[PDB]
Design a protein around this ligand. Structure first.
Ligand SMILES: CC[C@H](O)P(=O)(O)O
Ligand SMILES: CC[C@H](O)P(=O)(O)O
Ligand SMILES: CC[C@H](O)P(=O)(O)O
Ligand SMILES: CC[C@H](O)P(=O)(O)O
Ligand SMILES: [Fe+2]
Ligand SMILES: [Fe+2]
Ligand SMILES: [Fe+2]
Ligand SMILES: [Fe+2]
Lengths: 194, 194, 194, 194
């Protein structure tokens, strides 16, 4: 569905549930009832983010509540990604090639799902670079080599030396950091954020 | 919070969780990395609904996921409405004054909460006008008089004669209709959609 | 649905999603595979709360996850309560008849919905008795008289004199207290927790 | 927390939100007010599943609502699993060694997370054995060899030959089946249910 059509149907839904008519709503917004009716007819495409903010406010709700869901990109409930179409993204922390993100399949039917094959470039734990924790839990699996894992307080953290085949879970907002085992050059792991 | 600032922070959050940088994102959108950086700096206010649709799509998520929540209009967790500031809205079904909606307090911290004092104008059950059911459950309480309630199939519905003080619950999407008891003139009830 | 049958189906579901068979599960619990199979066949009725605790633990989940939902008590999506079948419950704070709760309709399809007609017995604000705030938001409507509302810090609270017909919203965990307006004897309000 | 203590605190919470006192609740259950008070004091451990069913019913809610959450087994937000402590479970479909499940790390803070390394034993697509779809989405990654994937209608399904390194997503309730590519002997993949 388009932003316009989704908005058109949801706006009408919301307007009706708070008992307003085109006239009533048009008044609170300083618009004409025809304008409002136009939106409800799919002509809202050029409304600005700020204007959408006002409409949501007047309807005592959020912009998200008035916009359609992510959408559906599945092929009969499935979506596949070949190994050569994986987007690559160099990760840099403190002007260093820390990670290399090879992005796996993603779908608008589960936006929070972000699976990655991560090349861990550095192999000096003492130079581990912490992220500040992030929303969503994360599942990890060591694909190759040994990983030196660090989590918690970046000043005084807990650590773990993980052999190939190990698997771990990091709750959301828990700060963590990885490097390959001391001197082993590099390691590789699968990270699934969900 | 504004639409612009909320968008700016959420866009950055999302861009980072799918591992893209300004360059990567700017490319999929056919924009310049400076443009994207501008959005992330609160300058997205004039983006159109349709453009927001594209950005969401490229980031494999929804517009709602990139926009801030409804907002907070409470006064230390509370919000009050005096009886004279209630918005009134005449309800018309089949060119008739069916209901009269007196809207009670609402808050952006619970958008689905829509409480109403409803004047039931007609008193001829045989002329009951059905709504087609709606999202969200609804709690009813008969404030004055007797209500003749109808729900289910509008062709062959179930009925109930409700005395003052009665209370009922209607699950979402269950079509219903009300009128005052046969010949009793009018009735009044409290309807709380949540 | 029964506790036994719901448990039987959900236990099997969970056992299968963690890839265990009767033997595997029976082992972690110190039971025989036949015992486990019995549970999955509706014979778990006499399992104790503590035993259910162990089963949940071994299956790394909660007891709730292994038990059926509240159930359905609706009559085609609706449930009605006549004014004379309302359960009455005297409310006492500091050995005083503070409130009188007349409980309205409730349903297992929305357990959090607790609507009440509350008789406010005291009319001395200075003797207001605070609750410590509670889970779930609450919608209030003054049915009769004047209410003296208090919320926030019980040591230094905010106040509001509410006329008949006023409506208010109290967010969850916000401590509040009510009495009838100073010297007006008593008042009455509708309180809907959802 | 224990089943007993969690129940004790939640029962009290629920009893209070529906305005009942020990006497009122004890009456609907055919128990003594002291009995009820005992439960609220952690002595409910021996209550049977069926009895818990009644208590939930009387309180118009679910057993889950009266029992504590799964619990917390993390070590400062993290939990690790070494490759040799992975529980193994042979998978059999039609009296054949179809799969071999090597279970990875799991946590009570995300019960729906069930990650597995799956050895795909058969390599004859024509003999693919379908599951009937299951709750929860699933992320797959081909670890070794080639997988012949099948999903949808088991009578007339869609197929995909997946090379090592491919990744896929299967929405919940979509029936699927895997085997190694025709004649290639065996394959191995990572399956993450969340
Ligand atoms: C293995 C990748 C890490 O979890 P990130 O969330 O990118 O810091
Ligand atoms: C009393 C008003 C009815 O519930 P509606 O939802 O407007 O049809
Ligand atoms: C009117 C009753 C109050 O809201 P309580 O939640 O009982 O303190
Ligand atoms: C790869 C394993 C399958 O997805 P299952 O859910 O076990 O049938
Ligand atoms: Fe991470
Ligand atoms: Fe309605
Ligand atoms: Fe309250
Ligand atoms: Fe599966």
């Amino acid at each position: 569905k388009t932003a316009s059509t989704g908005f058109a149907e949801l706006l009408k839904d919301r307007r009706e549930q708070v008992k307003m008519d085109h006239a009533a709503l048009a008044s609170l917004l300083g618009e004409t009832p025809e304008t409002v009716a136009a939106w409800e007819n799919g002509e809202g495409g050029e409304l600005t983010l700020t204007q959408l903010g006002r409409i949501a406010h007047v309807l005592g709700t959020s912009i998200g509540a008035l916009t359609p869901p992510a959408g559906n990109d599945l092929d009969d409930g499935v979506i596949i990604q070949m190994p050569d179409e994986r987007p690559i993204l160099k990760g840099v922390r403190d002007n260093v090639d820390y990670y290399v993100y090879n992005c796996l399949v993603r779908t608008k039917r589960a936006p929070s799902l972000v699976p990655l094959v991560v090349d861990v470039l550095t192999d000096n734990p003492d130079d581990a670079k912490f992220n500040s924790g992030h929303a969503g839990n994360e599942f990890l699996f060591v694909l190759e080599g040994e990983i030196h894992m660090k989590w918690g307080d970046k000043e005084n953290p807990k650590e773990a030396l993980l052999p190939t085949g190990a698997s771990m879970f990091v709750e959301e907002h828990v700060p963590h950091a990885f490097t390959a085992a001391k001197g082993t050059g590099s390691a590789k792991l699968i990270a699934v954020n969900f």
